[PDB]
Design an enzyme around this catalytic site. Structure first.
Site: not given
Ligand SMILES: [C-]#N
Ligand SMILES: [Ca+2]
Ligand SMILES: [Ca+2]
Ligand code: HEM
Ligand SMILES: *[C@@H]1O[C@H](CO)[C@@H](O[C@@H]2O[C@H](CO)[C@@H](O)[C@H](O)[C@H]2NC(C)=O)[C@H](O)[C@H]1NC(C)=O
Length: 336
Positions: A48, A71, A196, A199
Site C-alpha cells: 500500500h 508516506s 499454510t 509457510v
Molecule cells: C493486500 N492488500
Molecule cells: Ca502458504
Molecule cells: Ca507511499
C-alpha cells in the site's frame, strides 16, 4: 574491512545501523522472530505504500505519489482513511516508533521490516534490501490501491500504470500464501487465504483454483466467494485472476514449484521496493537479511480432492502433476 560495532561484516558502513533495527524488530515487533499477524500486516503495508505511484497522474500534471517513500506512516492521518487501509493503524504506530528511535527513513524501514518479517516464515526467499530512500514524502493520491471487488481489467490497468506486467501481478500475489482477512468478513476473523498461512509456498495458487464449495462463515462478506473447505476464505479478485485468460497460465505455472515461485516473487518485490526511486542511487545492504528456515513439504492438493476438482483455466498448458493427500476435507484454524 567494514566490521560493524557488533562484529558483523557488511559491505558498507551505511548498513551497520540496520543490525540494531534487526534486533529491535525481531525481539519486539515480531515477538521473538515469529511469523504471525505482524508479518502479514507489514506485507499489506509495503504494497500500500509502494503502489501509491502513478505515471499517468504525473503525465496529466497532477502529483502521482512518491512510491515506496514511507508516506503511509509520515502521512498516516490522510492515508489510513482510504478504503483499502483499514486494520493497519496499530502496526503503523509500532513502525513509526522504531523509525524515530533508530533514525532511519520510514520508506527504508518498511522495506527492511518486510525482508526481516519474511525471514521468520519457512520457505521464504532472502529479499533484496537497499537503503538510502529520502525520508521526505507527500501524501499518496487516493484511489491507487487495487481492491478485492475490482475487475481483472481494473487491477491490470492500475498495476500496469505503476509498471507491472500481468505476469508480475500474479508473481506479487505469492504474498497471499502468508495471509488471512480480518475486515472483509469479521465473523470469521483471521480466516486464512490458503492452508499454510505460516509457510511461503505454492498452496495459495493450488487452492484458489479449486472448485468453490463451502461458505466458511454465517453470511458472505465484502467480495467473498465460496471456498474449497471450512475455514478458508476466498476473495473475488483472487478467484477471478486465477481464472482469467490474461493471468491464468502464469497462475497455473506457480502451482508446482516453490523454488520458481520464490524467485519470481523476489524479482517482483525488488522492482516494487524502488517505485519512485532510482535504485542506482541506493546502497545495497542485503547481506544484513538472515536466511529463512527451508520448507521441506511438497505441493499437494489437500483433503482427498483431486485434479478433477480444480478448474483448469490455462487452455495451453496441461495442469502439472501435483501430489494428492488421502484425507477428510480440512477445516482451517484462524491464522495466528
Ligand atoms: C493486500 N492488500
Ligand atoms: Ca502458504
Ligand atoms: Ca507511499
Ligand atoms: C491484486 C491486488 C490485491 C488485492 C485486491 C488484495 C486485497 C487484499 C485484501 C482485501 C486483503 C484482506 C485484508 C483484511 O481484510 O484484513 C488482503 C490481505 C493480504 N494481502 Fe493482499 N491484495 C492484493 C495484492 C497483494 C500484494 C501484492 C501483497 C503484498 C506483496 C499483498 C499482501 C497481503 C497479505 C500478506 C495479506 C494478509 C493480511 C493479514 O493476514 O492480516 N496483497 N489483500
Ligand atoms: C522522518 O520524517 C518524519 C516527519 O514526517 C519524522 O517524524 C517525526 O519525528 C519527531 C521526532 O524525531 C516526532 O516527534 C514526530 O512525532 C514524528 N512525526 C511523524 C509524522 O511521525 C522523523 O523523525 C523523520 N526521521 C528521520 C530519520 O529524519
Amino acid at each position: 574491512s567494514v566490521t560493524c560495532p557488533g562484529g558483523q561484516s557488511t559491505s558498507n558502513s551505511q548498513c551497520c545501523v540496520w543490525f540494531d533495527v534487526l534486533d529491535d524488530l525481531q525481539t519486539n515487533f515480531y515477538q521473538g522472530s515469529k511469523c504471525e499477524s505482524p508479518v502479514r500486516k507489514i506485507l499489506r503495508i509495503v504494497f500500500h505504500d509502494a503502489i501509491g505511484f502513478s505515471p499517468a497522474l504525473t503525465a496529466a500534471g497532477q502529483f502521482g505519489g512518491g512510491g515506496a517513500d514511507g508516506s503511509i506512516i509520515a502521512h498516516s492521518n490522510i492515508e489510513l482513511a482510504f478504503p483499502a487501509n483499514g486494520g493497519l493503524t496499530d502496526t503503523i504506530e509500532a513502525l513509526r516508533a522504531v523509525g524515530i528511535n533508530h533514525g532511519v527513513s520510514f520508506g527504508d524501514l518498511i522495506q527492511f521490516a518486510t525482508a526481516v518479517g519474511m525471514s521468520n516464515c519457512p520457505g521464504s526467499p532472502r529479499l533484496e534490501f537497499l537503503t538510502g530512500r529520502s525520508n521526505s514524502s507527500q501524501p499518496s493520491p487516493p484511489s491507487l490501491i487495487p481492491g478485492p471487488g475490482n475487475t481483472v481489467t481494473a487491477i491490470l490497468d492500475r498495476m500496469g500504470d505503476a509498471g507491472f506486467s500481468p505476469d508480475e501481478v500474479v508473481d506479487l500475489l505469492a504474498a497471499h500464501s502468508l495471509a488471512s482477512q480480518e475486515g472483509l468478513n469479521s465473523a470469521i476473523f483471521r480466516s486464512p487465504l490458503d492452508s499454510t498461512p505460516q509457510v511461503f509456498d505454492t498452496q495459495f495458487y493450488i487452492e484458489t483454483l479449486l472448485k468453490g464449495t463451502t461458505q466458511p462463515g454465517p453470511s458472505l462478506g465484502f467480495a467473498e466467494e465460496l471456498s474449497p473447505f471450512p475455514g478458508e476464505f476466498r476473495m473475488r479478485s483472487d478467484a477471478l485472476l486465477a481464472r482469467d485468460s490474461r493471468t491464468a497460465c502464469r497462475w497455473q505455472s506457480m502451482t508446482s514449484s516453490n523454488e520458481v515461485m520464490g524467485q519470481r516473487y523476489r524479482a517482483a518485490m525488488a522492482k516494487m521496493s524502488v517505485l519512485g526511486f532510482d535504485r542506482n542511487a541506493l546502497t545495497d545492504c542485503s547481506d544484513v537479511i538472515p536466511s529463512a528456515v527451508s520448507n521441506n513439504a511438497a505441493p499437494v492438493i489437500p483433503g482427498g480432492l483431486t485434479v478433477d476438482d480444480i478448474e483448469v483455466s490455462c487452455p495451453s498448458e496441461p495442469f502439472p502433476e501435483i501430489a494428492t493427500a488421502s484425507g477428510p476435507l480440512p477445516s482451517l484454524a484462524p491464522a495466528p
